Amino acid sequence: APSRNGMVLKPHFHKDWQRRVATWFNQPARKIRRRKARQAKARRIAPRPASGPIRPIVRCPTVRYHTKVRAGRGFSLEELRVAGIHKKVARTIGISVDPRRRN
Amino acid sequence: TNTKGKRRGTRYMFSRPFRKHGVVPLATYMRIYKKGDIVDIKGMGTVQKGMPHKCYHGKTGRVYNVTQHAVGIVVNKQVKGKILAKRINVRIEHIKHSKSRDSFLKRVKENDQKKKEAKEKGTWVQLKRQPAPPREAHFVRTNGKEPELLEPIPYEF
Amino acid sequence: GVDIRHNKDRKVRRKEPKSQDIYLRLLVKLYRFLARRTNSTFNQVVLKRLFMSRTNRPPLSLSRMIRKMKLPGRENKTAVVVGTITDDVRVQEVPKLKVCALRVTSRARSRILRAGGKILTFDQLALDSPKGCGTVLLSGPRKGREVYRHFGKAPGTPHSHTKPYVRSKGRKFERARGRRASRGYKN
Amino acid sequence: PSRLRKTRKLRGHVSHGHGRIGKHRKHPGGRGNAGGLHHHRINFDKYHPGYFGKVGMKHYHLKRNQSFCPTVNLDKLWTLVSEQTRVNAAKNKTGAAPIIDVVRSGYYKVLGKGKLPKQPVIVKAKFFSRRAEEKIKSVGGACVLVA
RNA sequence: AAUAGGGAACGUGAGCUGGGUUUAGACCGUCGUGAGACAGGUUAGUUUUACCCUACUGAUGAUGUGUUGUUGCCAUGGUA
RNA sequence: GCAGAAGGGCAAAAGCUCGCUUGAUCUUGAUUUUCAGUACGAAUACAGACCGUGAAAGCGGGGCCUCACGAUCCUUCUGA
RNA sequence: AACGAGAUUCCCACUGUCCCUACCUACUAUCCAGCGAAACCACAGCCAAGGGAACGGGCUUGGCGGAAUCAGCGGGGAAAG
RNA sequence: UUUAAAUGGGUAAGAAGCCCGGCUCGCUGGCGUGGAGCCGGGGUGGAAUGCGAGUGCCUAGUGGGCCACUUUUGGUAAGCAGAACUGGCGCUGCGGGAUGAACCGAACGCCGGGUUAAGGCGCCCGAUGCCGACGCUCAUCAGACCCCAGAAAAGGUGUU
RNA sequence: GACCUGGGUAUAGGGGCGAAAGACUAAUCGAACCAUCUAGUAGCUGGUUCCCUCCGAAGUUUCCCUCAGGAUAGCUGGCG
RNA sequence: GGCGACGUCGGCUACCCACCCGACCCGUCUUGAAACACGGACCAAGGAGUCUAACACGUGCGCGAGUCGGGGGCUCGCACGAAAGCCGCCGUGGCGCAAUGAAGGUGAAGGCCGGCGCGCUCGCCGGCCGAGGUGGGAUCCCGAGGCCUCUCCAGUCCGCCGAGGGGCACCACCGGCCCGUCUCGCCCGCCGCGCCGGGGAGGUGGAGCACGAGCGCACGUGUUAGGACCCGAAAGAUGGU
Numbered sequence A: 001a002p003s004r005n006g007m008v009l010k011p012h013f014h015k016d017w018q019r020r021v022a023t024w025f026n027q028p029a030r031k032i033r034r035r036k037a038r039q040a041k042a043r044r045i046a047p048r049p050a051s052g053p054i055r056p057i058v059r060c061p062t063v064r065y066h067t068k069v070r071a072g073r074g075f076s077l078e079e080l081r082v083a084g085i086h087k088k089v090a091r092t093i094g095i096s097v098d099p100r101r102r103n
Numbered sequence B: 001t002n003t004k005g006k007r008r009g010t011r012y013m014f015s016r017p018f019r020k021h022g023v024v025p026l027a028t029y030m031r032i033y034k035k036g037d038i039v040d041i042k043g044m045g046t047v048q049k050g051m052p053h054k055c056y057h058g059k060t061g062r063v064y065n066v067t068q069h070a071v072g073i074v075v076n077k078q079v080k081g082k083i084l085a086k087r088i089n090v091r092i093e094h095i096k097h098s099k100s101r102d103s104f105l106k107r108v109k110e111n112d113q114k115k116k117e118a119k120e121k122g123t124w125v126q127l128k129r130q131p132a133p134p135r136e137a138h139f140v141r142t143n144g145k146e147p148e149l150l151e152p153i154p155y156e157f
Numbered sequence C: 001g002v003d004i005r006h007n008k009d010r011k012v013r014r015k016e017p018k019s020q021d022i023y024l025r026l027l028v029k030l031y032r033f034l035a036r037r038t039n040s041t042f043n044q045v046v047l048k049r050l051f052m053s054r055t056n057r058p059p060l061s062l063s064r065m066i067r068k069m070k071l072p073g074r075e076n077k078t079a080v081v082v083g084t085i086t087d088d089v090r091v092q093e094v095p096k097l098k099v100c101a102l103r104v105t106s107r108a109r110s111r112i113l114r115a116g117g118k119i120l121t122f123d124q125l126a127l128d129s130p131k132g133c134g135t136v137l138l139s140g141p142r143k144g145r146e147v148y149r150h151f152g153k154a155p156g157t158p159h160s161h162t163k164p165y166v167r168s169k170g171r172k173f174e175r176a177r178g179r180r181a182s183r184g185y186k187n
Numbered sequence D: 001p002s003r004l005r006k007t008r009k010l011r012g013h014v015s016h017g018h019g020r021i022g023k024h025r026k027h028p029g030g031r032g033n034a035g036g037l038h039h040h041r042i043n044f045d046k047y048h049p050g051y052f053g054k055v056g057m058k059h060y061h062l063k064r065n066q067s068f069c070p071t072v073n074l075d076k077l078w079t080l081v082s083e084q085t086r087v088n089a090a091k092n093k094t095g096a097a098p099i100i101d102v103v104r105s106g107y108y109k110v111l112g113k114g115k116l117p118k119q120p121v122i123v124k125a126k127f128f129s130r131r132a133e134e135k136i137k138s139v140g141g142a143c144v145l146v147a
Numbered sequence E: 001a002a003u004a005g006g007g008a009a010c011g012u013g014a015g016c017u018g019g020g021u022u023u024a025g026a027c028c029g030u031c032g033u034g035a036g037a038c039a040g041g042u043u044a045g046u047u048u049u050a051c052c053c054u055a056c057u058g059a060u061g062a063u064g065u066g067u068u069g070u071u072g073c074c075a076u077g078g079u080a
Numbered sequence F: 001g002c003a004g005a006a007g008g009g010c011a012a013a014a015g016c017u018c019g020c021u022u023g024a025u026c027u028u029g030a031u032u033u034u035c036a037g038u039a040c041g042a043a044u045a046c047a048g049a050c051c052g053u054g055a056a057a058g059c060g061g062g063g064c065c066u067c068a069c070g071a072u073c074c075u076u077c078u079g080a
Numbered sequence G: 001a002a003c004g005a006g007a008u009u010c011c012c013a014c015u016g017u018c019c020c021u022a023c024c025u026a027c028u029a030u031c032c033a034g035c036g037a038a039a040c041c042a043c044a045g046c047c048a049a050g051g052g053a054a055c056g057g058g059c060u061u062g063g064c065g066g067a068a069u070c071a072g073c074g075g076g077g078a079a080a081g
Numbered sequence H: 001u002u003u004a005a006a007u008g009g010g011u012a013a014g015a016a017g018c019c020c021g022g023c024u025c026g027c028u029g030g031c032g033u034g035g036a037g038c039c040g041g042g043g044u045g046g047a048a049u050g051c052g053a054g055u056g057c058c059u060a061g062u063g064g065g066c067c068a069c070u071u072u073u074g075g076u077a078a079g080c081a082g083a084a085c086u087g088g089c090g091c092u093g094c095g096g097g098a099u100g101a102a103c104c105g106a107a108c109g110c111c112g113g114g115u116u117a118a119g120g121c122g123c124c125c126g127a128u129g130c131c132g133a134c135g136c137u138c139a140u141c142a143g144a145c146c147c148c149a150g151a152a153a154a155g156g157u158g159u160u
Numbered sequence I: 001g002a003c004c005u006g007g008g009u010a011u012a013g014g015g016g017c018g019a020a021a022g023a024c025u026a027a028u029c030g031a032a033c034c035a036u037c038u039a040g041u042a043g044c045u046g047g048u049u050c051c052c053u054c055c056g057a058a059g060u061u062u063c064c065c066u067c068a069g070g071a072u073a074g075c076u077g078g079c080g
Numbered sequence J: 001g002g003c004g005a006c007g008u009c010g011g012c013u014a015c016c017c018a019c020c021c022g023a024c025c026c027g028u029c030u031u032g033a034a035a036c037a038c039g040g041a042c043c044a045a046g047g048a049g050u051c052u053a054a055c056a057c058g059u060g061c062g063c064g065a066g067u068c069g070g071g072g073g074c075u076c077g078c079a080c081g082a083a084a085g086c087c088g089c090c091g092u093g094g095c096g097c098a099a100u101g102a103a104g105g106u107g108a109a110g111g112c113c114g115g116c117g118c119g120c121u122c123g124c125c126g127g128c129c130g131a132g133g134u135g136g137g138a139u140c141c142c143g144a145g146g147c148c149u150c151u152c153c154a155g156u157c158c159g160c161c162g163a164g165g166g167g168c169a170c171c172a173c174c175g176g177c178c179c180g181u182c183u184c185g186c187c188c189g190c191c192g193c194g195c196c197g198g199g200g201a202g203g204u205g206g207a208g209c210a211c212g213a214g215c216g217c218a219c220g221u222g223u224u225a226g227g228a229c230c231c232g233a234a235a236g237a238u239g240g241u
């Protein structure tokens, strides 16, 4: 059953897998569902911006990626203090606030 | 089954045949082998230290290495499905020169000086050797006497 | 009856190309008209390289070309290569060599034409030279693939150099007995 | 495509391409990699020497971010920049040398390889091999380390 | 008078009989720690179908001779 | 006679006595033997080290040679 | 001792167990009237010798062969289950 | 076991050679030594006969074999068990052996002509329906074509 | 008479029950039946559906708790 | 050149019959089948090498030191649209371009000239280049010489060209280089003189280098895992009547 020169194989099929299969025959039908969940949410609220609030500037935390810069989670909580805006008007101004963040 | 051993079918072929026992004659050591000298293998039985294998008692090879007491020889041992150029380290006693290349080396050397001898003589000498030709029409003589009649003898026990 | 052969009487080479490429079929019909009428060989070598498969027409790099044309005797000849010319970046300076090939890439044919070369295909070669006189015919490294380094004696016996198939080159993958004498044996 | 394959071609031949004698049954030699030690030994070896046993030290929870050093050797070093500069930084005036930093291209280490051309270079990388920097300090170039 | 030796799927079970062998019950002896074993022994133990073709034994017959009947001959085959 | 089973080998010897002695030591490869031309084992020539012997050339990395032995995992001990 | 649809041997009386079979009756079988299955089935069915997968029905060489059948019959079909 | 056959096995029958001339070397070392190495220069017809050869890839099927001369081992011996060389059936018809896996010929597209092979030529059955040639043999169980399907010791004034 | 018999009730699968035979437990018992896991595994038998054209073998080596099988080489084809 | 109708002339099909010769019944295991080896009464329809993943190799296509949008996003509220089109400061990411080592780690260029420090086998310097050499190697180039109605005057040519040159792919070899260990050895460097780094020359281990050839997609073949070509048990387990 092993024959001339080839690859040793470990396929993970000894476990019964014909019950836990997940066909994606609806992955178009979810994209046309979650554009309506945006288009009837982009006009639903306001001339407030879509694509969420203003997100911070964040540097990636590993030796692999610390040369590039990522959008993060929220202003740490002294940027609200240095720029001089109260911490619980900041999320209804439309700025995203991350409470537990260090600087 | 049949005891896959070294030195097995060699009651007769690793022994001095007769009246030739004792120490080896010392001309066997005063031989000069170079990288390329074609040699054959005939293993002696007094010098236990390098004798090749019973596959090689009588197979003619060619030197590729010379050492302080042995000679590396490459030979052709027939295996089942093919042959193999195999290389063997044989001691100096277990071989000897091969006289199978004398009657090429002399007949090229009387085809060099015999080529240029006919070159300044002006001919087409045909130095290439030919196989044994059929008997050209000879001519016999029955000088005086006449052929002796013979006939089969009668049966006796 | 006749003999006891095991048959090689059917030759096995290519005679018509297995690609349904209608443009290569307009270059077979050009050259096998010129192969049997040239009374020479350069067509009959080009005519069988248009038959060959995708593997046996390897991608000739640019820098193999401009090295084999710097020999004494190739100074203004027009290099012909059956196969694709891809540019290298390891060389810096490209002369104004003139080539003639199927499918030079987009970046290579910039770098040939900007330095003042000329590229061709095999239809403005015939008009220039039906004999194909004054050319060097090139081919890439057909044994350059990673397939050919799997091929050798067997990846187990002495002096292997055969790169045995593993699913990941790393530790505890084919490195325990068969590779070192402290565990098991060494090949 | 069921036309082109073999089970149309072999439809009518009784044993269907698996012998009258072995008569291919279900699993004659054990399922999968069965018997790599015993009866498929000659096939598990010669074709996979090294397959059986420990070889190294454990490193529990290795993180694939700290062995991260993508490597340029110098023959790919001029093609990180626009070629409009390496002709421009080769104008005979002075040592007008441009920076070429690999760490804004995705590389951390400059390995050695021969045949660098004759322009003066300064290279920002985190790691240099000692063959590589003497391939830069021989073209009148410098080697500025940074991280 | 003689109590000759033999063969025919060790002739012969849809001919029979079951006495022994050779299932399951049981007893004894010897062997085995034991379950049990024993060409050692004993007792108790379901024997299926022919209506198919052939062979055969009988029974009407059949062709050919114009229909039909009476009296006959005998090729052969059996054998005291 | 050569320790032992046979076969081969051996005479200022491979035997028998004598005198020293640790080469039965460290080390990397190549090759031979059964072979699929894998592995263990055994064996062969070498090479680098340290030595022994001999006055010396030399010989000596176990037994005169053909058999005397054993993977992964695990345990143990040693080595920079 | 008694007892036993227990096992074995002998004796008396008895008898178709037998020597050695014969006859008679009833219900079938048999035939007609009516109703009417299954078992099984490559093709089918005469024999001797030969060879053959060593014991055929079919091949070889011989012997030979008449329609369609009924009542039986248990040699064969290495019958059928 | 002194000797030692036949058959068999190895090698060789040229340019990949041969010769001359010169430089490296840590090897060897009385010695421009020895030996390898390299560079340049000189001359192609070197036994027969036949033929196009080389090299890489992937991999199905198979892993129950038997028979024949010849040489052999067990066995009293076998259509027996085990071998060696080569052929053959298996996978393969056809002609012949009456019939048959394997013998003797001979190998196959479909056909018309001609000829032979092994074999046969009383009639089944194509062909001696030849003025075939020479001798032997009579059985009250004649004999009658390799494998092959029935025989010996011994004996005869049966006959040459 | 340690007798036979109707209905009610109790005991349920490694469990019931047995004056003991591995009997009986819904024709099923040296472990009942019904459903699912499950289309359970099978080195083992049975089968495996169109035509032409080309090539066309193997029963041996080595190893295996191997001897009805597989691996490896051998032999084959296709591709170049 | 000849012969001839209202019933004749040719011609056969899945037609019947008669004759001669040939001919044992088919699937199957098997060294061996007609078997006294098994299955097969007949006929219709159903009825058995699939799909998914992974790999390997061959071929085909596109791009090519790179390739790939498979996942999201964009376009109006379109049937065929669950399609197609585009994104690129959507390339994150896969696989490849870089191997070796247990691991810390380290990580692939020599050549030619000249000048030199005892040119001392060690070594130092600038210059030109630049993938090393040997032997084969299709092809291409030079090619002495020849070849046309008369001999001397010249042109593009052609064909046969002896010899010679450059040499693709590849095959064998020699050298080099990178990494792991081992023997021998001397030198240098200073974010600071140390049980510090760096190097050398030999010999081996490596799935390496020596001007890269891969990715994507489709198809075939083969192997494995999945009920895995279809059919088949004695069992085993849970949960119940």
Ligand SMILES: O=C(c1ccc(-n2nnc3cccnc32)cc1)N(c1ncccc1Cl)[C@@H]1CCCNC1
Pocket: E046, E048, G081
């Ligand atoms: O009835 C039968 C009977 C007889 C034969 C079969 N067979 N045999 N093979 C057969 C194939 C198909 C059909 N039936 C078949 C079946 C049953 N009995 C019987 N006889 C003897 C032994 C066994 C039994 Cl059961 C009884 C028992 C008591 C006496 N009265 C009769």
Ligand SMILES: [Mg+2]
Pocket: D017, D018, H060
């Ligand atoms: Mg197949």
Ligand SMILES: [Mg+2]
Pocket: D018, D019, D021, D022, D023, D024, D025
């Ligand atoms: Mg099979």
Ligand SMILES: [Mg+2]
Pocket: E074
């Ligand atoms: Mg009468």
Ligand SMILES: [Mg+2]
Pocket: J033
């Ligand atoms: Mg049959």
Ligand SMILES: [Mg+2]
Pocket: none
């Ligand atoms: Mg249960």
